[PDB]
């Protein structure tokens, strides 16, 4: 006959929003916002991935003959 207290009276986390498992660790959050950042970096630049993997298959995504992505001087 011992009416033990429970978790919501014990820890008293009254009415919180839903939060993130990745926010529960400060290291895993920066692991997964750096993976997001270096996936966004492939969009802005063109990233050197490591060279030719196997046989040269082709450009795999298209070749634009009208676009020139080169920096003109002055």
């Amino acid at each position: 006959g011992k009416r033990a207290i429970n978790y919501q009276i014990l820890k008293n986390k009254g009415l919180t929003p839903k939060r993130n498992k990745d926010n529960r660790n400060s290291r895993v959050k920066k692991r997964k916002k750096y993976q997001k950042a270096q996936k966004k970096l492939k969009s802005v630049r063109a990233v050197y991935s490591g060279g030719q993997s196997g046989v040269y298959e082709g450009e795999k995504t298209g070749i634009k003959k009208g676009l020139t992505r080169s920096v003109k001087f002055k």
């Binding site: 920066k30 750096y34 993976q35 950042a37």
Partner: peptide
């Protein structure tokens, strides 16, 4: 901020 992002992500730092 992008400096610390690259450093913490490339070296596995906590904060």
């Amino acid at each position: 901020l992008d400096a610390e992002l690259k450093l913490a992500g490339e070296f596995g730092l906590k904060n």
